[PDB]
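Hello again,

I reread your note about wanting to compare the complex against the isolated chains. To keep things tidy I'm splitting this into two emails, and this first one only covers the full assembly. Below are the input lines as submitted, including protein chains and any nucleic acid or small-molecule components. They are followed by the predicted structure of everything together. The single-chain runs will come separately.
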Amino acid sequence: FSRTCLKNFFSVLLILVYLLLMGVAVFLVYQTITDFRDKLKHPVMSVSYKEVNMYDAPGIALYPGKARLLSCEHHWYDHIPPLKDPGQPGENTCVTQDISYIDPYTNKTMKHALIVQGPRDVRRRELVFLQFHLNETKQDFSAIDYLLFSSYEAFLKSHDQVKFMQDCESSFSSWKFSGGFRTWVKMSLVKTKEEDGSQSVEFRQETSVVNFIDRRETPDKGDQLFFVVFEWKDPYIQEIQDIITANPWSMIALLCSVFLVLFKAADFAKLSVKWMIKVRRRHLKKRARELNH
Amino acid sequence: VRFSRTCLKNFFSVLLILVYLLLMGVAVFLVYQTITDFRDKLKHPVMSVSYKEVNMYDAPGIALYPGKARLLSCEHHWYDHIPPLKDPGQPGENTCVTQDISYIDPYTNKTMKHALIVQGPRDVRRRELVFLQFHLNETKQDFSAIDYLLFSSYEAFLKSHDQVKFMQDCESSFSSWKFSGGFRTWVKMSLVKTKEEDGSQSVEFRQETSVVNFIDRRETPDKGDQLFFVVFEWKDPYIQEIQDIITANPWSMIALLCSVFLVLFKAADFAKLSVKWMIKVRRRHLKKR
Amino acid sequence: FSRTCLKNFFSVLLILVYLLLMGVAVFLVYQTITDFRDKLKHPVMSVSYKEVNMYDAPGIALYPGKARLLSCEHHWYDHIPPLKDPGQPGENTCVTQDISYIDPYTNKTMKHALIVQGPRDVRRRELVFLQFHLNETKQDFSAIDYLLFSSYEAFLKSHDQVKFMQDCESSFSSWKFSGGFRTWVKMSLVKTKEEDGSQSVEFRQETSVVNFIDRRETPDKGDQLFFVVFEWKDPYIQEIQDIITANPWSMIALLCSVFLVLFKAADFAKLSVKWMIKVRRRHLK
Amino acid sequence: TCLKNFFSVLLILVYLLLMGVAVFLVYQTITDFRDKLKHPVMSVSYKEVNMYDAPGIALYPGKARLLSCEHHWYDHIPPLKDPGQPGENTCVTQDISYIDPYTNKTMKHALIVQGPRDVRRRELVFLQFHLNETKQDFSAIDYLLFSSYEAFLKSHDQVKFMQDCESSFSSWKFSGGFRTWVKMSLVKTKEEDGSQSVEFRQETSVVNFIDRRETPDKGDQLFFVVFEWKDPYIQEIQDIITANPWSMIALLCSVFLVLFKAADFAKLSVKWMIKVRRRHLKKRA
Amino acid sequence: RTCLKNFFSVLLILVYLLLMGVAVFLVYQTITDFRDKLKHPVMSVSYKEVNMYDAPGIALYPGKARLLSCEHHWYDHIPPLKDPGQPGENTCVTQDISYIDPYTNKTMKHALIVQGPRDVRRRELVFLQFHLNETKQDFSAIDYLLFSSYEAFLKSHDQVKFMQDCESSFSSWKFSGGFRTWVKMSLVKTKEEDGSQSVEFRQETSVVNFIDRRETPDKGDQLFFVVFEWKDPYIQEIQDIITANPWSMIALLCSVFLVLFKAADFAKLSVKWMIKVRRRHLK
Amino acid sequence: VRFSRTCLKNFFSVLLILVYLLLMGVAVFLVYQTITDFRDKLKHPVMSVSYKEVNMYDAPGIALYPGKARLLSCEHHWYDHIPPLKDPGQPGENTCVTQDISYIDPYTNKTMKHALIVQGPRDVRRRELVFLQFHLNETKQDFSAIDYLLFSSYEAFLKSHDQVKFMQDCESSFSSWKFSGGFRTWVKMSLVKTKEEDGSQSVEFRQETSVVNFIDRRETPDKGDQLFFVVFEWKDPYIQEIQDIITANPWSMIALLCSVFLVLFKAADFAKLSVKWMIKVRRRHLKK
RNA sequence: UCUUCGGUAGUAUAGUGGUCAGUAUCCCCGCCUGUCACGCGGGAGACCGGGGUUCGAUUCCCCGCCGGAGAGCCA
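Full-complex prediction:
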């Protein structure tokens, strides 16, 4: 009767060894699929700078309003602008093209905008020096807004330019420089990576205002004089590449890991069951050898 | 002729010793290198960024710190493209949810500093702004400046009675920006949600001031009338989220190592079978019958 | 045709399994080759925050013109600058170490460095107050440049300050401070990693100008008094490291091991053809 | 035959001799290992330090108040000075006084200063003192020259520096006159554990001081004291151990193997001799 | 049980590789020790003896002084005092040429060079003497430097360069006024890798007071006196020795290889002896 | 078969001669490097240092040579960095041990130079220091100074005999210092012993004097009167040992030689194995 | 396609339900009888593979691999 119980105990051990590795496999595959779904939930960041040598012509959509473009001189490399007496017009050696459109988010108002061509040569540090004057009024807070878009010649050679300002304000953000300062804007360009098209352009900038010596002007009525430059901070275009360990990585790693752990989950069980039936037969051998020595 | 026997004696010994030596020399090499790589990847968790959109922000924690400065207005201009022109100096129109707390200084435990916490803007979509106005006619420092800090939520401060520790932890964590003394500082703000190992999102603020000079010469400021201005608003509806994820999975480490061990076992067995076959083909070639 | 055609139908499965395994292997190696084409973008960013307590004092290369310093009062303990007076030179207690050399860009211009030690502690908010002065001239906009580099001691200990400062000027950028504002320049470090781990660093800074009342010295010509409050802001430094996510060892291991499941599938094919042969033998016998 | 008894002894004799020389050589090599372990050798190293290494110069005037300091960043001829004028405390006169650690009864003072820098340009501290002449003869002012001024500043519990650095030096003084000029240099010895110790050694060179300027009427004192740096080639000392980590045991095993091989070869050769002797015996039988 | 015997044979097979691992570990340890020994070269000194020292180099920059006596007391120590200030007894091989500064490049240096003493057995000493007019510098001094041999200045050319090179190698010792600075000099030779012998001078001054009461120097004029005896009749010979020789560790590696071969062979013989368990069945 | 026999024999012979040769080349090459290494390490012995420690030094001799002066004051001020100073220039209070010997010179062999031998301080831990105030009449001593010489055994000087030679040899060996005529020469003598070969080690005194000036305001200005103080101490409670070790060991070197000879013998055995492989190849050649 | 016969050291076989899987040759070592074996004395190498019964199966049974033997269309 002892052997009749032993043949049941060893069957129980057989089933235990089978189901141990039949449950480990399912637990591991479920854990791996859950982990790879988690990885699919959110990708990681992969930046690259790809420094350039000759920037494109950028777009600067000023909204001067009632002011006047006194000067838009392009200091081709002159990091120290030639001092000139404020308060009078002159030297419109600029690439301005006054083009207006209706502003969205309002649906009721017209607003003009003298989009100008920005500097290109970062190595030479090309500049653009502006000067806006306005007869003082009740506004008491003189800020002249300005937008920024990547390509200017694209605006030059695009039919139905409605997009170029009816979408810039709806996409970009509206900065503004002060009245009575010289807002030094050191722009830079940053590119993202979307799955729909190819990429996108977003601007960054570091305004560094410096005071304006009101002498030699004497604003008796209070004539404010806006002054703006638009440098190019760096020859580098930090592009954001949103790399994913999500679509191909999940599938490939899933299939490989599972089909290669099934290998052990089968081989170890086979070896263990073979050797345990071997030891069962060995116990039978030793008891029957005690019987028939 | 024992030439075949001697060639066998050379081959099985040297070839098999070489193959079970190269097996170890590759297995231990790869296991050590990949364990080191696992430790390295555990050393440097990779960051994850995205932009979860928010239609309507909560009530932020703008907390002005005016030392003996008189508030003049709180107009929460809901959507105004530019706030309407205001005559300075005159008080009134202070429709801001305001509370004053002052217990102790977190730094040096020096003294009390009263705050003027405002509920702050909510609707980013309609570009809510909370345009302030200040006044410091009686100047003795002669070195103008006004301090302000931001915290996460208003009702979180309001409901919790930990008033002193609110301005303890907020002051210790958030830096102390100071909007300029005299001209309006259009302080757009944005939120950054960084995650932690425990799932806690300890948020911090990010702002991009844009100082606009004032032409407030309608005040006769000869006596020392230095009046300030502030504008808060929410920069973009989006919110940045920061989460550092573990790039190394030990449950993939173990799978990779057991798989390469199985590869090496199969390679050794195949090599043994192949050498046995190449040895035994001459056995059927030396004798024909 | 009763048995020869069946044997041909069995043997075409041999070529079938060969071509299937070839195609699957080619597809898998194509996927892995695309992965190591993405290897170009595999440089990813991993950042950490070293909670540093005591900080290295950094050199602060100011580049004044016709200006003259007035104070360097380092408020090691004080986080607040006590009230002071315009003009009136006093307590030039900094470590001004003028090394005025020629331009590194055009090699013609004259620059006048005034390296200051800067602060050390950040838990105590160690300010480094400064002050300048300039009698008015035809200077329609007034600005006093400056610049930064990694460490003061790396300037003091290293020899040949000529190239040490000349290359640093062109390498970094120059963000100035204005004529009449307390340009409260905070500062912080980003610790990036190069291809080998040389660990170059550059400076992040958040200026915040603030107006200064000038009635106390009645400048009747345009006298300008600058003020700079260089101060370390971050109680911890950011550590940018560009780790790469893929190594060829994983590629070769996974490929050569899915090769084994391919071989096992071939084994099942070789068993199944024999099983079908046995079944057909039983059926047609 | 009798030749068998003749040769049946030197067989075991040669193995006995080999065992004897084996134990002799193992004793010789173990004694050599003991000797080479009991006499570690040193290695001298020169490093070309280019810069500061701020030392914690100390002085113990007690009654001789300071009257001058200087820092001649490049001046091998320090110019004239007024004898007896107090002030110009350009030194970082971090004055601290502490009780004796050794006698535990004397209220000792200190006038720690900041040490010379710029060894390349030979920057040299300079001093000047004064003391109303008292009953004590042989006017002497003790002074230590411990190192690490920069860490001395930030160090906590400054009593320990004074109470400890006295024991680890000999406190060489400077005289009551004639500008005891004091050069100095460093030695960097390596301890047994792995740490290192830095000690200052100095080469005074006194030069007589002309008193044709003070014209004292009592016998007052104006003893200077001058510091500098000697050649920057700081001596690094390392006490390396004789290279016997495992070579002794490996060559012990080698001599073991060769002696066993030689014993076996001796057996082979003597067996060959026995074979040829048996052949000769059969020839001559 | 034959399967057990083959499994023990497989155990010996596994043991066969732990010897390889230990050998490779010892090889790595040996290569690390070799690199360490090539990283810290050892030093040695041998005090050789010299019967007749070379006539050394003595550079002096008196400035506005004037050598009043240059007597070679061959072995006598009796001090003659004719007059503290008179010029006389210039009995030495002296030679002065002024050269511009090789360091500042502006000033000129007046190298009033004196040959010096040779016979250490007789303890030759070159008793100098110098007087200076009163000046405002408030403490007198004379920088003086030494070089290898006066003959290296006598016959050699480029005498301007031959002194200009020896500018900052030494530390510019100096004797004072109203003193008798006794300078016992010794010479140390270092032996570096490139076969050159850089000679250096090391000396131990011992100032002794002087009596000017016999000259009535109330005005403020100071005197100077120097001697330059050679201290020891020896020369320090410091040699840096490399203590690592690859041709002394290749034999170490070979011995390791032989002992591991013997160990493996003994393991094989041990399992062959273990076959006695089957040999008993054969019996 | 003649051609095959000739070619095989020449091929085997050239292989064996090539390896046999190499064997000899590496043997002579290694014995050459052995010769070079052993001769080089015999030429340049390598020296070592160590620092033992004591708390109570023995009594060292101090051979003063006062030509005309006198022991105005001798003391044993231990532990007192402020020695009790009396009125200068007044004799008495000599609480030391002396022996006014007067022996011969090695250079003149005729002068009976005095030597007021004293024993130095011993308590380094309590920094004991002697104090030897003197005075002379300097009628003509324009550069006043009295020599002093250090030997390391006062106790062994006492009980020993032939004291003329016991002072003669120490005078010859150690160089003669001198203390200033009008200063205070603080002499912090350290003790250095070198463990030489021949079963003998010798001691050497090295010291760094530090003159500190003396003020004579307490004595009336006189002609032919300059006094001077000399101080002896103990620098460190250490004793530096300079011992020379030897790098080369004949036992180790012959061990290397035996190992490489074993390796080359095994290489020749593998050459013999190649010979037997050639023999079997020739057996196959004749079988075919 | 079907039906038998056999498969063992490197060679030839002999063994078989309970074990010096043996022997001759071949492989190694001691003797040199004129010789590197012409002759002796000691030591060494194996059940075609897989599964199943049996205390144990190289033996008993089944399935695959290898030959050789026959009918032979398997076209």
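For quick reference: Chain B touches chain C at residues 30, 33-34, 37, 41, 44-47, 107, 139, 141-145, 175, 177-178, 180-183, 209, 211, 224, 226, 244, 247, 256, 259-260, 262-263, 266 (CB under 8 Å).

B.
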